[PDB]
């Protein structure tokens, strides 16, 4: 068996959702911001936000909404986790003591169901009579909000329309009514139903179905003054309400897909719209009052306000202030002005909240020769792309290097006092027949530049037609100084060439230190690329020189230096090249039994291979023979995101289902076969998507640091900006910390009353397993924050083992010291 | 796909046993003894008639590729029966076969099994499997005797007399190389034909085509009387050579 | 020749790796030195010699040589380890079973979740599967181990069943005692849970019905660790075993012993409303509690869902791609 320890060094920073309301008091204006597994509660002021409370939940927050049922003084909070844990929460404050009340809770997962493509949707009735949930295709789940439903029991109504895009409850209806856009073979259509809690079924809805834009994406429930709904698409915005129908199709929105909406004026007169290029719009509902005294919708107008960060959620707060919640970049507070500035913008940034964004790749480098190690991460996407330099000093110090283009891979080349970074920028087919970039960025603002002139694929004769306006990716190798972080050089790769891998190393007997990039020719026609290049560069005297190129028949997904040789993964093959005295790459040996060799890692003459469906396969290079040998394979099938080698026997993996697992050699050499079974001894549900695993530590090492119980240090980066550390334990230390977890879970009150053991249980859609071999460091490190009575309650009847004293009782003060040492590992 | 398991009579002059100096009579006697050994052991163990025959068929085929001077018959027979049990899902433990073989064999005969009988037998399973080319499925005249008899309609007692007499002829042909010369379907017809002659029964009348004097041609296509007579001659020879007479 | 078996040595095939864990032994992959063909090999260990050659292997070596079907795995030949010359007693070498290698396995295609199954894919997959089963059932053989791992799919969309090791012959005119609980519990029929021991061919039908729904839900229908807990889940969906729906349930050994919490009603159509109508009818018939009322393989092939499927179009599923 294996024993390991997981700690969160930096919490998730990406904003996954945000709502406003009256949650902490019926009087204050609140802003609730949701980051993965984290809820932040703020109070809105005239200058900005006052933080008041932050809680963790044992689950990914999928639905977050505020509502106020008749009889309550203030808003209640509904949250549903991605594992279908539902709860209703209440804020309660007793002077200085702030706590969160679980008013109702339960798990709403159906034994039989098909998860929907557009994900979990949750909405609440304007009369707060019920909560609607769209969890599965063909089914609508209703939780009625009666006082007695403390377990959140619910029923399903059969839904004929199997593929639903979005749904909302409507305002101004005699009964609870849903308005939704759905897709069938005849296109996309909008439709309504009424929800009867008494009959537990749908009844005919208030207004008819109409054919709507093929890419209709979002549904807006317009408030009582207008009523009805607005449907947002790629080219058009439409208003629907019985007999009334409007459509505005302004050319400005066709340029970039709109992804978020919020209401500015409670009466529905004004809405905010955002798009994937960061533009912020105002949608205006022009009113016309008839002599009847009735108010109708005359027209719709769209006005461009300015640019924000690409935003997952928008929420207008008050006055001119808007909160911009960003998942791909830094979040913001911005002020909307009535008068435009001299550039034509009505939007002016107030504050910037750090978001490590998607961490595509990262490396650890000791820039200042301190013995510490700082983390340089490839963070953000598109305009928000950045390099982030992170050091410990009690908070983390983060520096931001704007790139304005998507960062892909990073590697440090000390000999050149610089980094190599792979980047991609979006250009659009223009009238010249070439392409034009939407904005300047790192690869265009380099001091010196070069473009690959390889003719290897130039024989072409394969047609790829271009239409004006289509997007294309331009990949470039950036040379960036380690002190100024200035782009010294940019190398632009061939047209339709994607860079997938990057290493910095010496090879063979060649004293020169090279940048080596593995690329793949990507054409929309190909399900999988069949052409690729390996390019060897030398950065010397401010210029990047192409040293050699090797054509491959596939995609160079990953590369790694192997004892003076170059180990590369091309499609279904893993290859080892030698670097000749003629400065060319030569095939030495191959391994072929992989579906897609996506990730690679080396220790000694051993190699770990990560496949799309075949999990992890342990290879070894056999020098006496000059070839590879299969050592062992994990027979449980998994979809890999990144792998790492912990030691000569233990191997770490990351699944696409937000799960972490550890494989080991079966350590029983009875039969050759037994060792060949890489047995998963560790299973853990991280709840975050790991892209990169990297050895190192950010803790300052003065050489005086007490040797911690934990041994080893693997840092990992995730999509939501969470950074974690995995380390190993002895059997004794595991058992102590494991037994303590079970004791802490009985003591610590969970938000929503979510069982911790369920939260960390391995979870794929098909299978679910209890966690094993892993210690939730955050649960252990929360011992220091629980009140003294609870601390002593935890240590009752707690015995140590395998120590200086075989059985040794624990006191509250003994454990406080142990955990405090464990907080120094990160 | 499937191997050919049938030879011509002329070919039996050239079995390994023949070419190592064994004369035709001795190999013939050696085959009867082994087949009857397989028959007697399994009957003592209570084995189904198909299981006995399958062992016997393996046995006969085996000594088409090997010599009786290098492979003692009784070990082979036991091995054939042992495997036949597992193939026909009437399994028996090897130790029980050895026990029964010892009861029926005198001391000289059981000397073939050597010091460790179980081990000498187990070593032969490997060769047997390779020799039979892993062709485990075997069809036997018994199933055809019954499939064809079911289609005869007439005096219930005369047909049952025909079946039992033919059934006995099948059991007796397992001591001969007919299993190696003709498919089981022909054997079933030949024994019906033989019993018909001996009981003075005209089988065509029982068939659906009573005026079709070659009654068998509706069961087995392309069989000349030449073949059925050759089979009958070979069957009655065993009776004339021995002291036993036709069952009637 | 092609008919000569047991003589060719394993030297001719070079071992690449170990593809997976099987029913009774781990499976490997190789290429012939003479032919580039990739194959699949299972090691038969005769070293125990408690009773010679394994009887279960003898079962697989008998049935497969008889079964010929596009949707049934073919055993190409049997090979051996190096044998000592003139030393038959000393020889301890083992035999291997040569099989056609398949590009993908349903267990790894579904577990990863990358694959996407449209209705038309499920149709082509089910039609081939049931046609193979109908072939084997028409030949009066019972598989008894229908599982995702034994289901294999080529990239082209051709499917074949694989490990026939646990399979045994079924006698219709006369019942015989068997080995009771056989199929993986997730896909085991209620009759085996209650110990019918003399199981009918419908045990395989129930399994394939569990597979059918699994394709639509992208999740196994019945997941448990305890036979009673499984019976609870089966009862919650297909209805609890009761004399009205299963007249002969009272004759089953554990009918009184093993009981669900409640007498649940059948909600199969309700819970599976999303499944298309043509398929839902197939599931209701395949997942019928009474083995006597449960549909046959032929009846599944003469269903609206599968009758009009043309095997010329094999609809390969969305096997993984590069942006994927
Ligand atoms: C008679 N018979 C035939 C077979 N057989 C033929 N091909 C296969 C086969 N290929 C799928 C596959 N595995 C891979 C491993 C690494 C890389 C690529 C892979 N592709 N998988 C399996 N299994 C064994 C149990 O685990 C999964 C299913 N069994 C097969 C077994 N018995």
PDB file of C-alpha atoms in Angstrom, chain C residues 12 25 39 44 73 89 121 123 130 136 171 201 221 232 254 270 281 320:
ATOM      1  CA  UNK C  12       6.975 -17.309 -33.796  1.00  0.00           C
ATOM      2  CA  UNK C  25      -5.990 -15.654 -16.856  1.00  0.00           C
ATOM      3  CA  UNK C  39      -2.886 -11.370 -32.153  1.00  0.00           C
ATOM      4  CA  UNK C  44      -2.654 -22.033 -20.204  1.00  0.00           C
ATOM      5  CA  UNK C  73     -13.975 -14.226 -31.546  1.00  0.00           C
ATOM      6  CA  UNK C  89       8.576 -36.253 -19.002  1.00  0.00           C
ATOM      7  CA  UNK C 121     -24.186   3.282 -32.972  1.00  0.00           C
ATOM      8  CA  UNK C 123     -28.220  -0.153 -32.895  1.00  0.00           C
ATOM      9  CA  UNK C 130     -27.558 -10.292 -30.418  1.00  0.00           C
ATOM     10  CA  UNK C 136     -24.470 -19.428 -29.931  1.00  0.00           C
ATOM     11  CA  UNK C 171     -29.239 -29.165 -22.261  1.00  0.00           C
ATOM     12  CA  UNK C 201     -30.019 -19.098 -21.753  1.00  0.00           C
ATOM     13  CA  UNK C 221     -27.827   0.380 -14.319  1.00  0.00           C
ATOM     14  CA  UNK C 232     -32.921  -4.290  -4.151  1.00  0.00           C
ATOM     15  CA  UNK C 254     -34.141 -17.974  -1.679  1.00  0.00           C
ATOM     16  CA  UNK C 270     -40.891   5.954 -16.313  1.00  0.00           C
ATOM     17  CA  UNK C 281     -39.561  -1.571 -25.395  1.00  0.00           C
ATOM     18  CA  UNK C 320     -10.940   9.525 -29.462  1.00  0.00           C
TER      19      UNK C 320
END
